[PDB]
Amino acid sequence: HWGYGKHNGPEHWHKDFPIAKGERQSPVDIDTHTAKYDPSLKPLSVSYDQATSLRILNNGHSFQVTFDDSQDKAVLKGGPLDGTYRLLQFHFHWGSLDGQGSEHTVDKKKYAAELHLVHWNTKYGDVGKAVQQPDGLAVLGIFLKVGSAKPGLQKVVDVLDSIKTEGKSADFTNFDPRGLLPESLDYWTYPGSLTTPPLAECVTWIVLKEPISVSSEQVLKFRKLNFNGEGEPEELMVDNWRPAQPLKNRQIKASFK
Numbered sequence: 001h002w003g004y005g006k007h008n009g010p011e012h013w014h015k016d017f018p019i020a021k022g023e024r025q026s027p028v029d030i031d032t033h034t035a036k037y038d039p040s041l042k043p044l045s046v047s048y049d050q051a052t053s054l055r056i057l058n059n060g061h062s063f064q065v066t067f068d069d070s071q072d073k074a075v076l077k078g079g080p081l082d083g084t085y086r087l088l089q090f091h092f093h094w095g096s097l098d099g100q101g102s103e104h105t106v107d108k109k110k111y112a113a114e115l116h117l118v119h120w121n122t123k124y125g126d127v128g129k130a131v132q133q134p135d136g137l138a139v140l141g142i143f144l145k146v147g148s149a150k151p152g153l154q155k156v157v158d159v160l161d162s163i164k165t166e167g168k169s170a171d172f173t174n175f176d177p178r179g180l181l182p183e184s185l186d187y188w189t190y191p192g193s194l195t196t197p198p199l200a201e202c203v204t205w206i207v208l209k210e211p212i213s214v215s216s217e218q219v220l221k222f223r224k225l226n227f228n229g230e231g232e233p234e235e236l237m238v239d240n241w242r243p244a245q246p247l248k249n250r251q252i253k254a255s256f257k
């Protein structure tokens with residue numbers, strides 16, 4: 001089964017998932033000097049006021065906070081997107097050290113972690129159908145650097161002890177994901193893929209330029225999670241990131257000058 005270890009990590013994934021070597025794989029390095037300002041891009045619309053979080057789960061490769069997506073409650077619109085995308089879950093990728101952990105890079109710079117807010121296109125009815133479409137998902141990517149604490153993250157970090165190992169979940173209601181956003185919604189966008197198997201090429205990526213700051217204590221608690229299940233040898237959940245993939249025939253567009 002796939003993971004981030006030495007003989008099941010990203011360099012192995014193509015054997016079970018040939019699309020790993022495909023034409024629009026993610027993440028990528030964002031070369032800021034080559035990204036072109038696109039004046040026809042619209043401002044992002046992030047409408048999270050009615051979000052209903054449900055559960056938090058350790059799935060053995062990250063932890064995810066899940067939302068009620070049976071209605072238009074928390075949606076992403078505008079920007080590069082046509083139509084309405086419902087928030088399904090968010091999760092993170094992070095490192096064993098502050099100098100690595102993000103999946104996207106900016107002029108080859110790696111951040112300590114990366115937040116992915118995953119949304120699916122409501123015209124396809126459910127997320128399973130959406131992942132089979134080239135415009136099925138929109139993922140909002142946000143970089144984390146280590147410095148001052150992010151108050152809106154603390155509720156997440158404080159429940160992680162209760163989902164230490166693979167397969168554990170806990171109630172996680174009334175969490176407001178607006179507390180995870182930076183001030184600016186300036187972004188880069190490009191067509192790409194899931195960054196975990198099955199690596200489906202169904203994602204419009206929207207990566208925010210402004211990172212959020214989190215404290216060393218907050219990210220250290222990420223690194224106390226386990227890849228393994230309860231009663232198995234402990235393997236810390238760290239470095240659960242896929243490295244940058246070939247850009248190939250794609251252009252990254254910027255929403256800002």
Ligand SMILES: O=C1NS(=O)(=O)c2ccccc21
Nearest residue numbers: 002003004005006227228235
């Ligand atoms: O992602 C992973 N699954 S695993 O528990 O086999 C493991 C061990 C070491 C490093 C990473 C990983």
Ligand SMILES: O=C1NS(=O)(=O)c2ccccc21
Nearest residue numbers: 116117118139193194195196
């Ligand atoms: O681990 C993931 N990174 S991602 O935002 O591309 C994504 C989308 C859907 C399911 C999982 C994942």
Ligand SMILES: [Zn+2]
Nearest residue numbers: 091093116195
């Ligand atoms: Zn992700």
